[PDB]
Amino acid sequence: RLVRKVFVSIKGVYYQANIKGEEVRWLVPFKFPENIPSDVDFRIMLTFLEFYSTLLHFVLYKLYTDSGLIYPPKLDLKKDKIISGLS
Amino acid sequence: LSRYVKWPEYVRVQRQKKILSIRLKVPPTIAQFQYTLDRNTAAETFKLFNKYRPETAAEKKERLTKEAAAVAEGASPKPYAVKYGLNHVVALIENKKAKLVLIANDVDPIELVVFLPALCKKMGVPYAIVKGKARLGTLVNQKTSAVAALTEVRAEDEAALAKLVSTIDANFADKYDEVKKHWGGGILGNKAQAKMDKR
Amino acid sequence: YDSPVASLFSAFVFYVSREVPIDILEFLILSCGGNVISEAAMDQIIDMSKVTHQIVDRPVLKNKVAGRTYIQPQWIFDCINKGELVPANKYLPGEALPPHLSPWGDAIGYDPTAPKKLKMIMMSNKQKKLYKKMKYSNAKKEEQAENLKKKKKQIAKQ
Amino acid sequence: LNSNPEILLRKRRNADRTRIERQELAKKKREEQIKKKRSNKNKFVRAESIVAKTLATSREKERIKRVSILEDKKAKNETQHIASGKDFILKITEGLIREKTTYDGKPALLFIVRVRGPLAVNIPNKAFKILSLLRLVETNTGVFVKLTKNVYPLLKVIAPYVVIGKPSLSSIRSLIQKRGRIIYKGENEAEPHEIVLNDNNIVEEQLGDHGIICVEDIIHEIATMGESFSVCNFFLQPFKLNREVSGFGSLNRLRKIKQREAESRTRQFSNAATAPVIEVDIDSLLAKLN
Amino acid sequence: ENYQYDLWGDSTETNDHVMHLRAPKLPPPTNEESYNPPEEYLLSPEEKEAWENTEYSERERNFIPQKYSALRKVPGYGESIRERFERSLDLYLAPRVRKNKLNIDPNSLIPE
RNA sequence: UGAACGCACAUUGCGCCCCUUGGUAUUCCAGGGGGCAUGCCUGUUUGAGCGUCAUUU
RNA sequence: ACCAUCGAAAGGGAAUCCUUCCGGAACCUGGAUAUGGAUUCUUCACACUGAAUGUGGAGAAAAUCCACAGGAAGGAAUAGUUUUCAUGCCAGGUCGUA
């Protein structure tokens, strides 16, 4: 229960949470089909994602273990087949 | 100026040898190696020969270790593969055991294989000159192989080998047996044919 | 817990309808202390016992059962930013929403919810240029604010 | 002078020109790929290709004729000299087990994915007609269908060209929310643009009369076969899926080898009149294809 | 066990070097970006065309504000991949400069 | 110093690479430590050559 | 596009005088930087940006210094670009020296 602020915009939804005394704001796009432009270079975005994924792996492990939770969390395959979200 | 510096010496010699290959009047025994199997016959020959490729080191080691592990706790048919190695294949030919012998046409010491078509014809063994010594090594798991041979074949492919032998007899032996024994390499260049053939 | 936002919706059970995106609303409700019974979750191969609210987005509702409170999604989006459970009268199915302002304000400080030249001679050249740049920046900010005010007044005319 | 330290990122140089150049390069690459693709239809045709096509198409045609005669015999309740009168369904699931169950009369929801058919086979008239009414001609493309007693004989004719199974709610939701297409009018004149479902305004404009005002209402009418199932099903148009392995480098070539090696065990076709309709786990496949 | 241990642990080490320049985050969204902004934020057709004709690197705002009467009416953003791509391009191609931004009022520069 | 090996040498001259330390120190200066010859062999990695080839399900 | 390196204490060569120490006074070279002014309505003046490329002068065979054609690129709203304009800071090893 760390969510502090929310803002629904035309680009997506901005969530601001309080992680260890820091304000963390991230944008989640709407769940709609995307139109991929041939202009962009995914060769760079893939490296950026490769770095960010490992950063989150370590940060999530630290956050889960500091709070006494078990990591990685067990996936409920029965509840994953209906909505497949955070729940 | 001096533009020769656009080619290193090894490239220049490498191309000079290529020119000398087609300008010189080569003897028939070395000339016969320019007559090789065509596209269809060579493509059909390597479909049969690729089904009897010998086991690699890793596969043979794995197969032997499985048997060893089975034995350590608590009647097979003869294998089939393509025969290679120059001495082994030559010994097979003169014993009349090889059913089909593929001879590479680009052996650098060409005298290693000059006697092979004659030995195969004299001993009544079907043979074919196949373009590429690096391609014979792929079905042998070596970088290059001067020769390849088929001594025994699985009963499923006995008809295919006979049909391939007949095809090579019709396409390669009976087709080139008159021009095989003629001196080759008398190709004339344009600057030379213009002044000799025309005049 | 340590913040009022983490205590909101504690004794609430929301019935999230099909129209509203469950992904961005169940997360917000659960992160405050609520419970979600999504309508989109009964399409695979409950019966709304303890539900106290319902988030709808249809132009017109059908059932309107007594007891429940019917709201539009923005209520949640406005109950978190204030953190004080704003009244649901302005968020009802079928009317116009309030303007949902950003938690981080306006770029130029404009508030939407609202009712020398003789001494410049002695300045050096670089000081005068810097002063003119600063005055131009301030004038542009004020002009951008006044344009928005004029547009608001024209809108409120009709 | 009352300053505040900060870090500043300078603007990138010549970004717009690079953007325009990349757009032009992408367009040129697409155009030249099309050029080379349609320029390769005039190449020499070897005899073996023609013979193989004839033989394989002759085998497939006999398969279809046998299946059609068997279904005609079962339809007229003339099941006296037929091999089998039961509508079997085979469920393949991965250590790979098979369930051979009799099909009910109960309608079901299926997601049919158009895969590449048998090699050296020209699609005969019956199978092509069935695939054309299903709007499944482009490979790597899927469609939602309602399985009933009359749809079942159709699935036995187009079996080698498709892979079938029952999707879950999460698969349906992710499929509609990631790959949604519509034939919608352009600016003023150009009709046949195939655009993505970005807003519910177009859905309300098109399907609003039936009561469908958002994408999530299409998801409801598809997940549960409703009265307006057909209207939205023929409104969504076939889904453009992603092929499993896409490439011809060494890593991708060996991925292709490993993927084909597993296809001999998952999509099995008996080439018989009484062949069961093969059903697989669509959730995992769509996890691969999404 | 990939990435299944504690990296930082209890350490409180700092990277405060003279040439460690950190990217200054990203400005927060404002009112005009909202899905239901006050009516005065919408652009006139003349302003819309002025924005449309401006170069992509010369635009003061990278979007046109829109007002939606409901949440279900909001469309998926179109230039969502491109914004992330531009941010990632700036993160390693844009030179980083230390600067002391001024914060005085203009009237202090006037001679007394 | 010498077969004598970073380059020269009738000079006790002139360089390059890596790590580290000290003085206002991201730029400057200095100190300390370790390296940089040729022919040949085996292997590793990176290449050149329209030299020989193969290349439609 | 074209070849290492050696070869001058009388050749070319940055700088000290009343030639090294002392006192006073002064230059040369290299480097990081700050201030003032200029770059005049906002964008390279009547100090005064200048890439590849091609030339000229001094040296006079080479080292070394400078300049010219050329038009690449860059420059503005809480410090725009340049700093051949002025001032301000630091340092200068080895060998010979009767």
DSSP annotation of D91 reads E
Contact E88, A45 (CB under 8 A): yes
Map residue D93 onto helix, strand or coil. strand
- Interface check for D173 against chain A (CB to CB < 8 A): the answer is yes
d(CA D282, CA D168): 8
DSSP annotation of A17 reads E
Instruction: Give the distance, in angstroms, between the CA of residue A66 and the centroid of all CA atoms in the same chain.
Output: 19
User: Given an 8 Å threshold on Cβ–Cβ distance, is C40 in contact with D220?
Assistant: yes
Protein-strand F interface by C-beta, 7 A? B 8, 11, 14-15, 18, 39, 42-43, 105-106, 131-132, 134-135; D 43-46, 48-49, 52, 119-120; E 18-19
* Any domain includes D259: yes
* Any domain includes D24: no
* C-alpha distances in Å from residue D154, one per residue of B14, D232, D279: 66, 22, 14
Tally of helices (H runs) and strands (E runs) in chain E: 2, 1
Residues 6 or more apart whose CB falls under 8 angstroms from that of D194 comprise D181, D182, D183, D237
Number of structural domains, chain D?
1
Q: Which residues of E touch D200 (CB under 8 A)?
A: 72-73
Phi then psi for residue D286, to 5 deg, are -70, -30
- Examine residue A72 and say whether the peptide bond preceding it is cis (omega within 30 degrees of 0): yes
* Any domain includes D180: yes
Q: What is the resolution of this structure in A?
A: 3.0
* Any domain includes D30: no
Go through chain E and tell me how many residues it has: 112
Identify the CA nearest to D89 among candidates D78, D75, D103, D79: D103
Domains of chain B by range and CATH? 8-189 (3.30.1330.30)
> Quick check: do E and C touch, 3+ CB pairs under 8 A?
yes
* Any domain includes D286: yes
Buried b (16+ CB within 10 A) or exposed e, A1-30: ebbbbbbbbbbbbbbbbbeeeeeebebeeb
Q: Are strands A13-19 and A22-28 parallel, antiparallel or unpaired?
A: antiparallel
* Identity of the residue in A9, A62, A65 whose CB atom sits nearest the CB atom of E35: A9
Distance E97 CA to G14 C1' (A): 38
Q: Are strands C13-16 and C53-55 parallel, antiparallel or unpaired?
A: parallel
Task: Enter the tokens of residue E54.
Answer: 């401006």
* Any domain includes D5: no
* Any domain includes D17: no
d(CA C66, CA E1): 54
Identify the CA nearest to C5 among candidates D121, A5, E14, D156: A5
- Interface check for C7 against chain E (CB to CB < 8 A): the answer is no
Residue with CA nearest to G38's C1' atom? C125
Method: cryo-EM
Other Cβ atoms closer than 10 A to B94: 14
* Any domain includes D16: no
Buried b (16+ CB within 10 A) or exposed e, D102-132: ebeeeebbbbbbbbebeebbebbebbeebbe
Q: What share of chain D is helix, strand, coil (3-state, %, to 5)?
A: 45, 15, 35
For residue C55, list its beta bridge partners: C16, C71
* Identity of the residue in C26, C31, C77 whose CB atom sits nearest the CB atom of A1: C31
Alpha helices in chain B (DSSP H): 9-23, 28-31, 39-49, 57-73, 86-94, 115-122, 133-138, 158-168, 174-176, 190-196
Q: Which helix (H) or strand (E) holds D265?
A: helix D250-266
* C-alpha distances in Å from residue E99, one per residue of A40, D95, D180: 32, 65, 48
**Signed CA dihedral, C48, C53, C59, C60: sign only:** positive
DSSP annotation of D264 reads H
d(CA A35, CA A52): 23
The residue type of D188 is N
> Going edge to edge, which strands form the sheet with D141-147?
D162-163, D108-114, D141-147, D239-240
Q: Name the nt closest to B43 by C-alpha to C1'.
A: F54
d(CA D289, CA D76): 40
Domain holding D167, by residue range, is 43-290
Q: State the helix-helix crossing angle for B39-49 and B158-168, rounded to 10 degrees.
A: 150
Task: Enter the tokens of residue D45.
Answer: 């045709």
